[PDB]
Subunit: 332 residues, 4 copies
């Protein structure tokens, strides 16, 4: 399937890289009004976090050429003005972060796009996490949401734990790496004052709806999960900490065994499993949505456990966006 | 009371600074075989985390002179060889971290010390947290432990919450700043391989006995609390995240009100309270054991809440060591 | 003298704090259209880098009250619309960074301001560094520039070295801490692509005109100095490295002696001197423009030396802005 | 040639990885008394800086098996006790850092090693930098030194600049990433007190003999070069800043052209060249000894220029150790 990408930030560029790295979808158009073609070459080629791009990238005839494939470049501030149809983009990755509603994402449909995939949590678009509820998608849904990186980490582990033991209630804290929304030094932020404080200097607490959003993709867990986030001075990798009351008794070894069986089975490539003394850098550029950390977690008793899951919030989420597009194209 | 300090690391130096800043105890002797007198002057004077020492510090006649008070300096590897009695040190702050047992800490008693206060968790010495169980101390206990920084953060909040609502069970994660035991780059560590990975680069998971140690100082909570730690790339401030099942129903406002009343009452100066958009740097050089973060925490229902508490793991713990010594001297 | 402050960023807030800390000038008005009064209270009160503000700050009757002194707050995007005269602000600290020309800074003069002090390098406003050329100011200059933090570091040391030995030619590199213009992660920047790369992750090279701007305030050094900058992952403190060919022979001890004599004399409080094993955190919240690091620097021969000078690029520059205003008020 | 490796730290492990990545030499024995076989598996497999090891690594029958090649493991504190000859190690990479003299490195010769390559600067062993003076090696030198990472960065650029223009005198500052010798928090260091201060918190000044060591490998530059270092809070990549007086006039374009021609010619793979807006992360895992940064550097006039060169102080130096061993084996 041919894919257009709206926005060339972390999510847009890394979705493009995942498309080229795996070859699963073909990027044909990119829209970003604030990044010119040559600046796009520079930003795609050099990445502080994930290294230099393997393969080639250059500007030719007003087009971005990645691995010999010319990509049409648009500079539009309004999505409706983008000529997705002329470039042949059937799907569009809405990755700017400011068009995360059905009506705002349908502006891409006006521009010739057949379907729109929002790479952020959406207030009203149907939300899918690969390996959790993606089979609930059907070819009548024009606009979908891939949820968040944190949601794509929590939802598979929560699905496994609820399926085998039953989550009566769970509380989540994610220790999250620095993102583009933060400030290098103490500065103004609209209403989230803590996010305005210097990111390298601080442990910063944040509200996140990812744990509650797990209730959308796992309806039986609706209202049983919520949590918060502490932003910390790390570039890329984040970790999920889920503390939950289990309906059925579960020794920690039983949870480990069930999660390992899930990681080796239907959730392979989505839910990871490890028993090594892993740290955050060990999952940089990892493509899993969630890697269960067996040794990091701890249990108080048979019904109250604390579960740890790592996730590259950049690479894994982009690969999941690509996989969602592949599944939607398969269901055409 | 006159105090000797064994070890001149973070804990020893900051305990000395707290002694001089508040004037509550008199430091008269310091033992450290790896730090000479002039190096001691340098390390006490300049602090990356807490700034330069207000007041004066210089070497005179083989003695460390802080604010005009001469301090005898010993360079001994074996605590029994230290002449605490000749210097007049009635109390000794065992802050090296490698003499955290009753028999090892009694070597200071051999050297003329009347009492020994271990500034680390102890396997067998009686353990006290200020504001939680310190009134259980009596003048017949020669060797005591001040627990850990994390324990001194968790125990007061846990005491308040258990007293008013009852903690059926709680799980703790502390997001902890970098400490001296970590490595700048990936390097060898004896058995804790994760602690060997570069501290600035990683979110690092760690086992900690602080939550279980809260059961020592609050016996009714024994076996009902445990947890883990994630070390992160920050210099000083750490935060406690307590997720607990409450015996009695508690709206989040009720918990806030109870904790604020405790912070304004018997636990004043020990348990802090704030409703501001605080980040970690806002508690650097703070002397509280635990400052409740009202806005950071979240509740799922009336019986399952996630509570957030900040703590300067260096300054607060040192001030608590000083306060424990003051209380013990009062109970002489 | 009564001072208005345009912009409430790092420079504006720290200039306000320096005004209140030293009591040398009276802040009466602050203009910032993007930061409301209560957000101004928060941002002034809590500082990640310099700690919490000693003293009180709260909102009263639409005014910012710092240490009991009410400050009028304006929310204007155009400087000409600001009613500086009604608030009584004789001087204005133009600290936004986007009004650094005579014509743009005169909009404040339209609003009732008697004089305007630009806290950034200016293309055409007369430029002054305290202790270097500030006596060249006269009461006929309505609009002046305080140069940059880097210029205020280099110019006093360069003045001393040129006066005593003669700088045939010098090249400067400043290792500079992270500032507000950088990005937490790799992101778009207009034309300076390197400044768009993640600040915590990288050593980042940058062009700076500070060394050439030293030629403005020391005319004999015009065209003899230039340099560059490497931005690094540190919050506050920066260091200047000056490599220069000396007209007259100078042993390193002679340079040390001359610089120490200057630091103890006419440049006291402006040019610092130390022979201690200082690191960057040892100058956090330091108010000097430049502290000579005797041990850090090295000489190749009697005519080719590398000189090292530390500077808190936030605190020192703000205190120099305050001192420039005090001198201008004295020359009224 | 078959290679033994003494020490399994950053240098030893990365030299092993470079040996396996390029296949140029065969690692057959590793000695490290502080790292057991399974800990060696862990430390080799997971790298925070350079990512996970591509290929396989596991413990089999008391041996480290990297890519199916069994490596004999020794746990000896004294080099003379190591049985290099039994394992068949013809060359030994002395990478511990504490056997950097001819007599100390000859203990490996006692253990059956034919030749010893010290991966640190040596006081008396002959010193070689690839592309600078390595052709001065001959098969009669049993013990050699590969100099330092900084020396391997400076020497090729200095060689090119001196050959084409002539370096009358140069001063060097390297902005260097954090290394294993530093401390996470303020702590004791033997005599280098600044290196004891927290590495993540500070810009730290350091003495380095690399610029003077360039005079060893380029005799015509002896006594004409020296410099210093500022350690900064970055994990891996370092940059060299060379400020030099040129004997012959050189426009900056001429220097750029000469350096680019050298990078494309005899120094290919050793001296890099780029004109992109590179930052430090753009050279992580780069194998060049020195990549000239054309845009970063600046000139004051035709005889006084400041030249910038990046270098991965870990990967590049290890690859140069491998290349030196390959050249020595070719000259057998
Ligand atoms: N990086 C993560 O960890 C992560 C993971 C999952 C989801 N997300 C979410 O995805 C969204 C994208 O964030 P990012 O991580 O890509 O960072 P980012 O801020 O680098 O990307 C934003 C890019 O969008 C472009 N843009 C802005 N307005 C536009 C417009 N009107 N039309 C077109 N292009 C426009 C800008 O050029 C900018 O480069 C955010 O909302 C983030 O919350 C982030
Ligand atoms: N910094 C914190 O956050 C914190 C808080 C509470 C408790 N603690 C615990 O307290 C202990 C002290 O740690 P720190 O934080 O002071 O760091 P640190 O490692 O700087 O202090 C150790 C100091 O002890 C000295 N020393 C070593 N062996 C000695 C001996 N045999 N006799 C005398 N002196 C000796 C060394 O010179 C070193 O400077 C650790 O076990 C730490 O776990 C740390
Ligand atoms: N921090 C340093 O190291 C330092 C030192 C000396 C000089 N400077 C220079 O001073 C300038 C100020 O930078 P800062 O360091 O204060 O950081 P900063 O970016 O925090 O400050 C900018 C503030 O100005 C306000 N502002 C923006 N547009 C405005 C407008 N049109 N009218 C009024 N207010 C407006 C914003 O609210 C923002 O908070 C920059 O150009 C910087 O280069 C910085
Ligand atoms: N990493 C760099 O940037 C770099 C580059 C070039 C040269 N160097 C130099 O190379 C030397 C090695 O440093 P590293 O960077 O490998 O870091 P490192 O400190 O991780 O390596 C040291 C290793 O040597 C082992 N070791 C210690 N004593 C030993 C002994 N007696 N016998 C055998 N093995 C022993 C220890 O297990 C440790 O893991 C240092 O002197 C460093 O200055 C470093």
């Amino acid at each position: 399937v041919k894919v257009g990408v709206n926005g060339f930030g972390r999510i847009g560029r890394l979705v493009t890289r995942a498309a080229f790295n795996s070859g699963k979808v073909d990027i044909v158009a990119i829209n970003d009004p604030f990044i010119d073609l040559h600046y796009m070459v520079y930003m795609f080629q050099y990445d502080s976090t994930h290294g230099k791009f393997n393969g080639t990238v250059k500007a030719e005839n007003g087009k971005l050429v990645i691995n010999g494939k010319a990509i049409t470049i648009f500079q539009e501030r309004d999505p409706a003005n983008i000529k997705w149809g002329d470039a042949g983009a059937e799907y569009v990755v809405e990755s700017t972060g400011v068009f995360t509603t059905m009506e705002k994402a349908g502006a891409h449909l006006k521009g010739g796009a057949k379907r729109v995939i929002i790479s952020a949590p959406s207030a009203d678009a149907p939300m899918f996490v690969m390996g959790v509820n993606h089979e609930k998608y059907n070819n009548t849904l024009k606009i979908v949401s891939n949820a968040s990186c944190t949601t794509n980490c929590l939802a598979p582990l929560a699905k496994v734990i609820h399926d085998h033991f039953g989550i009566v209630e769970g509380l989540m804290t994610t220790v999250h790496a620095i993102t583009a929304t933060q400030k290098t030094v103490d500065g103004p932020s609209g209403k989230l004052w803590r996010d305005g404080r210097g990111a390298a200097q601080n442990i910063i607490p944040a509200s996140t709806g990812a744990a509650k959003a797990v209730g959308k993709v796992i309806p039986e867990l609706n209202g049983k999960l919520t949590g918060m986030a502490f932003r910390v001075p790390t570039p890329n990798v984040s970790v999920v900490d889920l503390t939950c009351r289990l309906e059925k008794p579960a020794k920690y070894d039983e949870i480990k065994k069930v999660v390992k069986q899930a990681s080796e089975g239907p959730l392979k490539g989505i839910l990871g499993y490890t028993e090594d003394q892993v740290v955050s850098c060990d999952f940089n550029s990892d493509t899993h949505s969630s890697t269960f950390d067996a040794g990091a977690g701890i249990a108080l008793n048979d019904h109250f456990v604390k579960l740890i899951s790592w996730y590259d919030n950049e690479f894994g989420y982009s690969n999941r966006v690509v996989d969602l597009m592949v599944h939607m194209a398969s269901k055409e």
